DNA sequence: ATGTACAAACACACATCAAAGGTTTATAGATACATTGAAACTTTTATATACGCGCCTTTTTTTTTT
């Protein structure tokens, strides 16, 4: 392989443990996008770490755009601190990353036609809307989006580690299906 | 001599029975709504990937009165 699956989004859940006044949360924040007509969750974008989070009336926050487990975790801790400054005793309790989506590259042109045709059972293709293949692995259970540019979009894991394992499993397939 | 009010036949005029049928309507078939709970349904996003299209937004061209 020799290629790290480069994460582009990490979505995580944080139980602040309080019924947050989403109106006051929006009011006391600096740049927060909350109005009920789209969702029941204040969405805040913090530039450091730059993450976008929706926090619900349950006080549960789901965070996206992180580049690491620690980007999301530190961002969520900052989010809880911001909520506490707002006035609600937010606390980092029973945190869990619900999604780790990444894009990386293997850089060798691929016979995507070969894979999809011979892995019709596993991968399906209708190249007249979107030129990417969809592949599944159960161990680890990662779904992977493949495009001729070599871009690999690995999704379906709470951790980047399942991303890494399925990438170490799928890059050999890619090189096998490398078009030249 | 002598036929007359009176009541029996004796076959019949008279009140009665009975089949048929419109009309009314519960009564039921079927009817069209009225309930509601329930699951089949919507949403973010970002995230790149590689598209348009229309609409944000703007530059260049286009058009009536004194």
Tell me, letter by letter, the H, E, C secondary structure of chain A. CCCCCCEEEEEEEEECCCCCCHHHHHHHCCCEECCCCCCCEEEEEEECCEEEEEEECCCEEEEECCCCHHHHHHHHHHHHHHHHHHCCCCCCEEEEEEEEEEEEECCCCECHHHHHHHCCCCCCCCCCCCCCEEEECCCCCCEEEECCCCEEEEECCCCHHHHHHHHHHHHHHHHHCECC
The C-alpha atoms of residue A6 and residue A79 are separated, in whole angstroms, by: 25
Instruction: Evaluate whether A101 touches A9 at the Cβ level (below 8 Å).
Output: yes
Structure solved using which method? cryo-EM
The span from the CA of A52 to the CA of A32, in Å, is: 10
Nucleotide nearest to A38 (CA to C1'): B43
Q: Provide the CA A65 to C1' B30 distance, Å, integer.
A: 62
**Beta-carbon contacts of residue A118 (< 8 Å; ≥ 6 apart):** none
Q: What positions of strand B are covered by protein, i.e. any atom < 7 Å from a CB?
A: 43-50
What resolution, expressed in A, was reported for this entry? 3.0
A105 DSSP β-pair partners: A151
Distance A33 CA to B65 C1' (A): 50
Beta bridge partners of A111: none
Chain breaks in chain A (C to N over 2.5 A) after: none
Length A68 CA → B24 C1' (Å): 86
Instruction: Evaluate whether A169 touches A161 at the Cβ level (below 8 Å).
Output: no
Longest dimension (CA), chain A: 60
CA distance A76 to A143: 26
Question: A177: closest CA among A155, A148, A153?
Answer: A148
Check: CB of residue A106 under 8 Å from CB of residue A150. Answer: yes
Q: Are A68 and A76 in contact (CB under 8 A)?
A: no
* CA–C1' nearest nucleotide, residue A10: B46
């Amino acid at each position: 392989s020799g290629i790290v699956p480069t994460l582009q989004n990490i979505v995580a859940t944080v139980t602040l443990g309080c019924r947050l006044d989403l109106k006051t949360v929006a009011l006391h924040a600096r740049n927060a996008e909350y109005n009920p007509k789209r969702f029941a969750a204040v969405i805040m974008r913090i530039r450091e770490p730059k993450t976008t989070a929706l926090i619900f009336a349950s006080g549960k926050m789901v965070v996206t755009g992180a580049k690491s487990e620690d980007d999301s975790k530190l961002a969520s801790r900052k989010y809880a601190r911001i909520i506490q400054k707002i006035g609600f005793a937010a606390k980092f309790t029973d945190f869990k990353i619900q999604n780790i989506v990444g894009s990386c590259d293997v850089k060798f042109p691929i016979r995507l036609e070969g894979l999809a045709f011979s892995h019709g059972t596993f991968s399906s293709y209708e190249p007249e809307l979107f030129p990417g293949l969809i592949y599944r692995m159960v161990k680890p259970k990662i779904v992977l989006l493949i495009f001729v540019s070599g871009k690999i979009v690995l999704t379906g894991a709470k951790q980047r580690e399942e991303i890494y394992q399925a990438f170490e499993a799928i890059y050999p397939v890619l090189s096998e299906f490398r078009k030249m």
